[PDB]
Design a protein around this ligand. Structure first.
Ligand SMILES: [Cl-]
Ligand SMILES: [Zn+2]
Length: 360
């Protein structure tokens, strides 16, 4: 049912998300499982030796394997095509220090595969190199993702920067009435409460309930987008006493597919907090946790496919994502507690976005 590579990409990106979620247990996190898989799929082409092994081992595939590069290319083009209706602004980029002899033939080879190019910049001009990179990222995200590199992120010694940014403000197939949006009490994991804008809509929603292995029931709702291609999945334990982590730790691309397959439409009243999350994740620690350590270590990093004439290592590997959820006697579903969301491309089964709303 899913694309073989879409599954590999999604499963990989999900494992990375779980690493971020475990690190920031009680903070908001919005992440792109597909984005991180994609930028790391590209990194495979620049990477060699042990550094490549670690990435390949973690992703479950080699950009080397036959048809693997086309597959990703087709997947991307499928996700970003006009037929989707619901726009997704995304960008990735490898920035390399200028005046470093690159492996003759790599540039055009990288382009033939991913239809992107490696950008060369002078990190010597720290603040200029930083603006060049940030303005690129903003320019290629409808101007939505700004300042992806904060002051200090890069210095005159930076030689390789890895960047990925996404913005999504989708429009629901069935919109929430503006009039129903009101301030409502949200219960945070620590037991405290804040009053936040929540949307309300009675409709025949896609819904189903799963149990955690330990037997805790949790609600899952699917909110399709007007393009009939993407869907948001909202999931959270029914019992507030059960932490959201109980879901995040069992999460997988495959589980989400089962959620979808078990959905039935039922007259429901959904109260869902209106929210706008922006998050930058430093991919280093999460990726290191998954066995990919070489790529960040100066002289141990093997990027000999990109440049064998001079040592390289990733100074920064950063993803920044902005997601906005807005308006665009039946059973009552109130998301007044920390919950997961998943944005999914259903035709391919790709997990584009994933996040936890710990505090709207
Ligand atoms: Cl919680
Ligand atoms: Zn299955």
């Amino acid at each position: 049912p899913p694309s073989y590579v879409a599954h590999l990409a999604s499963d990989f990106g999900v494992r990375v998300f779980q690493q971020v979620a475990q690190a920031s247990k009680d903070r908001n996190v919005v992440f792109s499982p597909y984005g991180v898989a994609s930028v790391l799929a590209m990194l495979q082409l620049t990477t060699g030796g042990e550094t490549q092994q670690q990435i390949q081992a973690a992703m479950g595939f080699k950009i080397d394997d036959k048809g693997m590069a086309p597959a990703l290319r087709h997947l991307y083009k499928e996700l970003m095509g006009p037929w989707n209706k619901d726009e997704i602004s995304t960008t990735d980029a490898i920035f390399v220090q200028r005046d470093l002899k690159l492996v003759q033939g790599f540039m055009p080879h990288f382009f033939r595969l991913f239809r992107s190019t490696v950008k060369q910049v002078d990190f010597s001009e720290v603040e200029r190199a930083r603006f060049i990179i940030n303005d690129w990222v903003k320019t290629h995200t409808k101007g939505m993702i700004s300042n992806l590199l904060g002051k200090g992120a890069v210095d005159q010694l930076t030689r390789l920067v890895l960047v990925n940014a996404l913005y999504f403000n989708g429009q629901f197939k069935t919109p929430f009435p503006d009039s129903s949006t009101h301030r409502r009490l949200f219960h945070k994991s620590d037991g405290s409460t804040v009053s936040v804008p929540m949307m309300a809509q009675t409709n025949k929603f896609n819904y189903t309930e799963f149990t955690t292995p330990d037997g805790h029931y949790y609600d899952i709702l699917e909110l399709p987008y007007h393009g009939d291609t993407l869907s948001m999945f909202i999931a959270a334990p029914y019992e507030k006493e059960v932490p959201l982590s109980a879901l995040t730790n069992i999460l997988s691309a495959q589980l989400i597919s089962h959620w979808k397959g078990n959905m039935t439409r039922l007259p429901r009243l959904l109260v869902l907090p209106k929210f706008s999350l922006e998050t930058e994740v430093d991919l280093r620690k999460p990726l290191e946790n998954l066995g990919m350590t070489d790529m960040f270590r100066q002289f141990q990093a093997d990027f000999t496919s990109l440049s064998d004439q001079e040592p390289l290592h990733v100074a920064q590997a950063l993803q920044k994502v902005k997601i906005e959820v807005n308006e665009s006697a039946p059973e009552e579903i109130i998301m007044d507690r920390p919950f997961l969301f998943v944005v999914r491309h259903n035709p391919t089964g790709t997990v584009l976005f994933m996040g936890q709303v710990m505090e709207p």
